[PDB]
Structures are given as structure tokens and as C-alpha cells.
Write an enzyme that holds these catalytic residues in place. Sequence first.
Site, mmCIF file in Angstrom:
data_model
loop_
_atom_site.group_PDB
_atom_site.id
_atom_site.type_symbol
_atom_site.label_atom_id
_atom_site.label_comp_id
_atom_site.label_asym_id
_atom_site.label_seq_id
_atom_site.Cartn_x
_atom_site.Cartn_y
_atom_site.Cartn_z
ATOM 1 N N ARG A 264 2.070 5.152 17.897
ATOM 2 C CA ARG A 264 3.136 4.160 17.750
ATOM 3 C C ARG A 264 4.439 4.562 18.444
ATOM 4 N NH1 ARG A 264 2.764 7.317 13.084
ATOM 5 N NH2 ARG A 264 4.793 7.945 12.217
ATOM 6 N N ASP B 296 2.375 18.304 4.611
ATOM 7 C CA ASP B 296 2.185 18.650 6.021
ATOM 8 C C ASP B 296 3.002 19.895 6.364
ATOM 9 O OD1 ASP B 296 1.500 18.486 8.800
ATOM 10 O OD2 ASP B 296 1.423 16.301 8.645
ATOM 11 N N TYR C 92 12.485 10.382 10.540
ATOM 12 C CA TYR C 92 11.807 9.623 11.613
ATOM 13 C C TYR C 92 10.912 8.455 11.165
ATOM 14 C CZ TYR C 92 7.114 11.718 11.255
ATOM 15 O OH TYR C 92 5.861 12.083 10.836
HETATM 16 CA CA LIG Z 1 -2.040 18.204 10.164
HETATM 17 CA CA LIG Z 2 2.190 13.175 8.201
#
Ligand SMILES: [Ca+2]
Ligand SMILES: [Ca+2]
EC number: 3.6.1.1
Lengths: 160, 160, 160, 160, 160, 160
Positions: free
Chosen positions: F31, F90, F127
Site C-alpha cells: 500500500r 512486532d 505511520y
Molecule cells: Ca515480522
Molecule cells: Ca505489523
Amino acid sequence: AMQFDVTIEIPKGQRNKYEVDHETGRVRLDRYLYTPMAYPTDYGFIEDTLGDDGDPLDALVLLPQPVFPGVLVAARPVGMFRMVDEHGGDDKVLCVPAGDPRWDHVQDIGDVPAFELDAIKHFFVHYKDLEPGKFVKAADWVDRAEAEAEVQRSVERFKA
Amino acid sequence: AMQFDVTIEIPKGQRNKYEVDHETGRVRLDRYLYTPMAYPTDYGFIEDTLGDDGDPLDALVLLPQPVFPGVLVAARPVGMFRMVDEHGGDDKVLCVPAGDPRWDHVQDIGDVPAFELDAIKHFFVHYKDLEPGKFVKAADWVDRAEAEAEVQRSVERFKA
Amino acid sequence: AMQFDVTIEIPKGQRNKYEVDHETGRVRLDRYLYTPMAYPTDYGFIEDTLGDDGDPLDALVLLPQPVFPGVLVAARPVGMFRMVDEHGGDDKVLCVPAGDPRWDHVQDIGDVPAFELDAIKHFFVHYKDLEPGKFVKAADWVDRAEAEAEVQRSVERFKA
Amino acid sequence: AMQFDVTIEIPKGQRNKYEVDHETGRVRLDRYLYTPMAYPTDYGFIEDTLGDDGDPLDALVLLPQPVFPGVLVAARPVGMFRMVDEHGGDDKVLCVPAGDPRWDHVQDIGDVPAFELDAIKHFFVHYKDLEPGKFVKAADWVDRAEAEAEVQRSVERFKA
Amino acid sequence: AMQFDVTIEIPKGQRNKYEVDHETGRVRLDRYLYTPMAYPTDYGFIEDTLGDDGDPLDALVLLPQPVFPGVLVAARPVGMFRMVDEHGGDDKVLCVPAGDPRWDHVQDIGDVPAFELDAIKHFFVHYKDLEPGKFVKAADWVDRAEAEAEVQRSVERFKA
Amino acid sequence: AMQFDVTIEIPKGQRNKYEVDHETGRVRLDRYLYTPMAYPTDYGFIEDTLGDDGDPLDALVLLPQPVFPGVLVAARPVGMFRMVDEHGGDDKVLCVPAGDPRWDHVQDIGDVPAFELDAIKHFFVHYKDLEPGKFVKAADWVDRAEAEAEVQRSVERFKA
Ligand SMILES: [Ca+2]
Ligand SMILES: [Ca+2]
Ligand SMILES: [Ca+2]
Ligand SMILES: [Ca+2]
Ligand SMILES: [Ca+2]
Ligand SMILES: [Ca+2]
Ligand SMILES: [Ca+2]
Ligand SMILES: [Ca+2]
Ligand SMILES: [Ca+2]
Ligand SMILES: [Ca+2]
Ligand SMILES: [Ca+2]
Ligand SMILES: [Ca+2]
Ligand SMILES: [Ca+2]
Ligand SMILES: [Ca+2]
Ligand SMILES: [Ca+2]
Ligand SMILES: [Ca+2]
Ligand SMILES: [Ca+2]
Ligand SMILES: [Ca+2]
Ligand SMILES: [Ca+2]
Ligand SMILES: [Ca+2]
Ligand SMILES: [Ca+2]
Ligand SMILES: [Ca+2]
């Protein structure tokens, strides 16, 4: 709604005519254009398709920023550009990114400004003008229904 | 060997049509081009010149790398592109950098590769197509002598 | 339609915060931004306007391609972004190019897609996060009519 | 603590050698460099200075992102590059942005990593190799104190 | 006329030294160059060749515009750059695009202007100055016939 | 000293969010970011790793110049960014180029400027702000030893 994967060969603003070789998957420079023109949108082809000639169905993808050669973009068709050249008919599906609400206002060819469509037409009419034995005789725009039909024809040909 | 200063308005590769306002000296965006075309060479005008058009004499400069809008380049003429548009004659003097020995092989219009002259001609003939009430008719590429004469004409007109 | 000249200071996609000195007319680098952000439109000010703080009226301009710092662009207003920062009230007129039929579809703030207004808002809300003693605290969009009134007030303040 | 305005003539990564005409303030292309080299930092001169040779004092500015030609940057010296060439003495002040806390760790020439200083040295030593009757025969770095002394000398000469 | 496919690793203007891994076909960043220099032409290797060091024969391609890393270009040899470095002998075939009439005026090494050949020599002579364990001892140009002999040897070795 | 290969998906300065498909190895545009932000370092993943998520372990690489999508960089860890978005947690290993003595001064997380670390943090926090169903809840920097443990972890799970 119909959607598919487009592989971009040539980003918007390019005078280098890149083509992806389909036997290998390698990006090649076919030629530097002989005219002072640049591709008006990101240009490529639809993956897992096949037209009348032995090549995938060509695609144009409208974007807020260009990608690079070899990049995949999931897209949905909103129209199609027909043209006749030195090798007869050539169809080019006009798409926007799939699953992106920023392009939901574009559902059909009439939703794309006349001025982007004219600029696209003008490119393909004129880009080979100075090339030996190459011309563009006819060119016009058809709607999403006709585009989706052509994609469906091309997917069927591929699977066969 | 004639030389003069050229102010570049538009670098090679641009679809933004910039213009120096000659009374004030500011760079302005005149328009984003309506056609999918890019200026094939750096484009501008010769300083301290004056045509029949109340404007300075327009100029094209062959370069290894483009400059940016407003930059001065010392240049010498090797020919001229003659054309008529919607406001009559609009001659454009083709130049190379002055005092640069890498351009000594280019002395007259014949020394420029035809393919580059073809592309320059193709730009000016087609870049305004999609603008309404606008058109161009290329007369011909003329030699250095014809160019120098026109430059000399427009320098005399300036001094007044 | 009301229109005016905007001098662009910062092209779209820049993390360098350029500013024009209003006496000298020189371009200055104020600072490299402390956040990983970039101006979502071309940014500058309206020429020959005087705001409430001694400075000219700020402007954002939507374009198909960015310009360079210092470039003049004739623009018409479609709305205005009102916000407060560390130095009080800060108003920024949103514009499109004037005399360009490709922007005829944008006549007021509602014609500008919300995604682009959200992004602009997001920029100004966050870009001075990592600068001490600097912030932006209010934010909301007002229509063309209010923008035009604010431009008119600023044109007069300047004349007096 | 000393500081001054640096006008950047050439951004980092440029093979086009731009120059400000100090009488008019116009940016000129002096020449495309003859060697396959690029300016390793942003390059220009210090405003309101006059060196021993009639021109302003040259300056190198370390930046996180380059500016464009003609841009002012408020800067402070951290060293100087001493060089003798075909025209004799040539001193270039190495600077960082003034009032930017991201450069407060850079106080003297020892704080600049040696890889950067060698690269800069390498540029000025080799960039005119292929230019005829042009060379540099001496090349040395000196500290902030020596740099500041030269700036001061040059400032005072400007006031004549 | 002899011709072959060159895969470009490094476009013109690059300081990033990209290398293709010849086992996998992945593009790798070998290193950022330690000198302030940029590749003066598009640089890569000839597909389906085998140099006597176990790698494909290196190639330089003259282009009107650079390509991207990994891109294929059909090309024909016009000369060869011979250099001696820390690895011993190192040959680099200088090429132009094959089947492009804009390059028909370049048939042998003498057709390339000296300022470009000198610049290419200057790059390879100086780019590893600041690199440790790396140096150059010599560099020379040889003609198309020598280049073709070397290509043909490297092709036969490929088949072995 | 731990080192590994990082494939860069996204160059620094990009608003296009590219991804490598780990089945095919094709580069895809996921994207265009909905925020006016750009990746502050080159971004990607570590080859031959398997994280908690079932995709490879993410990596950030500090570079003197960005690469392009799909390029391999030999890299060593100096720290790790821990975050919790939607989809679980993450982790991103911060790296520098391996075998490059220009980065020897960067051994642990303390050696990276806080200004760069805050900027990287600020990106990954904000973001996805405007994307529906996406968020961040916590963001922390941890040291080399912590990062090396998580890499080795992810290597073992790839082998198993
Ligand atoms: Ca990852
Ligand atoms: Ca992520
Ligand atoms: Ca195609
Ligand atoms: Ca086709
Ligand atoms: Ca065709
Ligand atoms: Ca002009
Ligand atoms: Ca004119
Ligand atoms: Ca005209
Ligand atoms: Ca017309
Ligand atoms: Ca402003
Ligand atoms: Ca304001
Ligand atoms: Ca403010
Ligand atoms: Ca703040
Ligand atoms: Ca200077
Ligand atoms: Ca000097
Ligand atoms: Ca000098
Ligand atoms: Ca020399
Ligand atoms: Ca090679
Ligand atoms: Ca070799
Ligand atoms: Ca070698
Ligand atoms: Ca060395
Ligand atoms: Ca990743």
C-alpha cells in the site's frame, strides 16, 4: 468485484521501454523511445492472462506514486483502451488499486477525468511516430463492462 | 565565434513548463503540460535579446547533464529551429556550451545527430496538441549562419 | 473565481523546511525536520498579503507534479486549515492552480477527498512532536467562502 | 561562539559545478566536471566575507539532506581544508548547521570521522586531474581555531 | 555482427557498488564506495560467458539514459578496457546497444570521444584509492577486435 | 560477532510500502501509506529467519545511501525496536553494514544518536494512525544482546 495482479514493467515518467521476458521473468530494456515522450501511467500486464498473440493482457494502473519495474500491484479494472498498430489490435486495461478506499470513487471509465484519458491516448498514438514501420491507426476508450469481459476472455485463454 | 548567456527555464525531462518573468525575474510555473511529453533538451532564452514578440529570443542547449530553472549557461549557436505557432513565428536557437572542448566537434547543424533533431522537432510539433486553440507548424532546421544572423538581429533590437 | 500568486517554499515530499526571507527574497533552510515526515502538498505563502502577525498568509497547493522552492504559481482557494501552535493562531489556505480546467471539479473543501485532508491534518498535528516547546493543538477545515474572506482581509492589511 | 550564513552553490552528489556570480547573484553553470566525481558535501561560500584573492571564503557544510543551489544555511566552523592549486592558496571552511542540537557533538576537526575527511580530500585532489593546466599540489586539514581566525580575517576585509 | 545480453549491475551515477550473486541471481550491495566517485557508465556483465576467474566477463554499456540494476540489455562490443589491479588482470568490454541505429556511428574504440574514455579510465584508476587491500597498477584501451576475441574465448569456456 | 543477510524491502524516504512475497520472492506494493510519513531507514527482513508471526524477522539498516527493493545487505545487529501493534507484537532488529569499518564506532544501541532513534520510533508509532483496524500500544528500544538473542531464536525456528 473482479480483481487481479498486475506486474508493472514501466513506471510513470519513463522514456526507457522496459519489458518483462515471460519465459524467464527477467526485466529487459527493449528500447529507449525515439520520441520525447514518457509513459503517462504505470504500465505493464495482468498476471496469468493470455491474449490473441502469445503475450499477457496489457494493463495501465493509476497510482498516487509510481513503483519500479517488476513490482506486483493488485488492481481492479475500470475501463480499457483499444488501439490498432503494426501488429493489429492491442488492448490495454485501465485499473486502480484493489482494496484501497482512496479509489472507490472510480468505478467506471466516466469517473476518470477526460484529461488523463486524452493524455494516455495521445501517448500511444504518438510514441512510435519516429520508429521505422510502426504506426497507430485507431484508438478509443471502452467501459469497465467491456474491460472485465476482455479480462475474462484472457483468463480463459490462459487456462486452456 | 559568437557566444552569449542563456538562462535555462526548463531542464531536460520536465513536464512542468516554467517561465522567467522578464520584468521581475521570478520563475513561474506557466502550466503542467496537457500532453504526456517532456522537454528533450534544456530550454530557455538568450539574455539581452529581443524579438518581434516583446520577449527574448528562445534557446535550446545540448548538455551532458541538465541544470535547474534560472541557471545561466555561456553558450554558442550551431543552428536554429524555425516554427510557426498560434502567435506566428517562434524561432529557437540550438546551442552547445561555449568554451567547452568536449563540444568542439559540433560546429553546425549537420554535426548534431538527426535522431536528436527529430525528437526536438517532435516535441514542439506535438506538446500543445491537446491544448485548445493551439498548434505548431515546424518550418525546418536551419544552419548556424541563419541562427547567428537572427541572434544578431535580436541583439540590435534589444539595444534600444 | 478569486485567484492569486503563491510562492512555493517547500515542494511535496520534503523533510527540509525551506523558508523565504520576506525582505531579501532569498531561500533559507530553517531546519531539517525532527520527525520522519514530509510535506504532503507544495507549501508556501500568498504574495502581497499581510496576516495578523506581520507575516504573509500561508498556502498549500495541490499539483500533479511538485515545483521547486521560490516558484510562483497562480492559484485559487478551495478551503482553509485553521490551527493553533506555540505562537498562537495559524491559518493555511488550501488551493488549486488557477485557470486550469483539470481542477474545475474542485470548487470547495468537500470536493477535496477526505484522505488528503486527513493526511495534511496529520502532518501539521505531528511534525513538531520531537521539537521541545513546539506543538500544534487545534485543527479543522473551513470552506472556500471563509478562505476567500480571510484572503481579502489579508490583501487589504497589506495595502494599508 | 562564531557563526555565519553559508550560501550553497553545489549540493552533495553533483557533477555540475554551479557558481554564484557575486555582482548579480545569479546562479551560473561553470562547467560539467571532467572527472567521474561528485561533490561529497554541500559546497558554497560564506556571505559577507572577502578572502585575500577578491572572492568570498569557500565553505563545506555537512548536512543530513542536501539543499538546492542558492539556499542559505546558518552555520558554524569546525575546521578548514587548506589547499594550494594552480591559482595559489585555496582555503575551504568545513561547517555544520548552527543552532541545531543534532550537530553539537561536532565541535572540532577530530569529531568528523576520518573516512569523511579523506573522501573530501580525495575529491579536491583528483576532480581536476583531466582538466588541462589545472591541479592541486598541497592538501591539509586544520582545526577550528585556525578556521575561525581565517573567517575573522575575511570578515574584516569585507568591511573595506 | 557479434552481440550478446548484458545484465546491468550498477547504473550510471551510482556510488553504491551493486553485484549480482551468480548462483542465486539476487542483487547485493557489495559496498558504498570509499571515494567520492560515481560509475561513469552503466556497468555489469555479459550473460552466458565465463571469464578465466570463474565469473562472467565484465561489461560497460554506453546509454542515452541509465537502466535499473538487474536489467538486461542486448549489446555489441566496440572496445575493451584493460586494467591491472590487486586481483591481477581485469578486462571490461565496452559496449553499445545492439540493433539500435542511433549507435551505428560507433563501430570501434576510436569512434568513442576521448573525454568519455579518459573519464572511464579515471574512474577505475582512482575509485579504490581509499579502499584498503585494493589498488590499481595500470589501465589501457584496446580495439573491437581484441574485445571480440576475449568474448569468444569466454563463451567457449561457458559451454565447457 | 553475529552477522546475517538482510533483504531490503523499502528504501529510506519511501511512502510506498513494498513487500517481498516469501513464497515467490516477487516484490509487491502492499500500500501507499495513509499518513504523510516516509521510512526513516532502509527497511526489510533477515533471510533464513522465522519469527513468532510465521514471517521472517524484520530489520532496519542504517546506510550512507539507500538501496532499492530486493537488494541484499550483509549486516550485524546493534539493538532492537520492540512494538505492539494489532496482530500481536512486532520486533525490528536495528543493524549496520557488516565488514564496513566506517560503522565500527557503532557497536551497541547507545552508539546510535537519540535523534535518529526517536525518529525511527516516531515513524512506527504513527505511520498507520489513519488506517482502520490498526494501532500501536507500546514502543521500546533494547540493546544488542537482547537483539542477538531474538535473531538466534528466529534462526532456530526457521531450521525447525
Ligand atoms: Ca515480522
Ligand atoms: Ca505489523
Ligand atoms: Ca505489457
Ligand atoms: Ca498488449
Ligand atoms: Ca503494440
Ligand atoms: Ca523562453
Ligand atoms: Ca520567443
Ligand atoms: Ca510559443
Ligand atoms: Ca491544440
Ligand atoms: Ca510559509
Ligand atoms: Ca501562518
Ligand atoms: Ca506554524
Ligand atoms: Ca514538540
Ligand atoms: Ca565557492
Ligand atoms: Ca577559494
Ligand atoms: Ca578553486
Ligand atoms: Ca589536470
Ligand atoms: Ca560485473
Ligand atoms: Ca574481471
Ligand atoms: Ca577489479
Ligand atoms: Ca586503495
Ligand atoms: Ca520486513
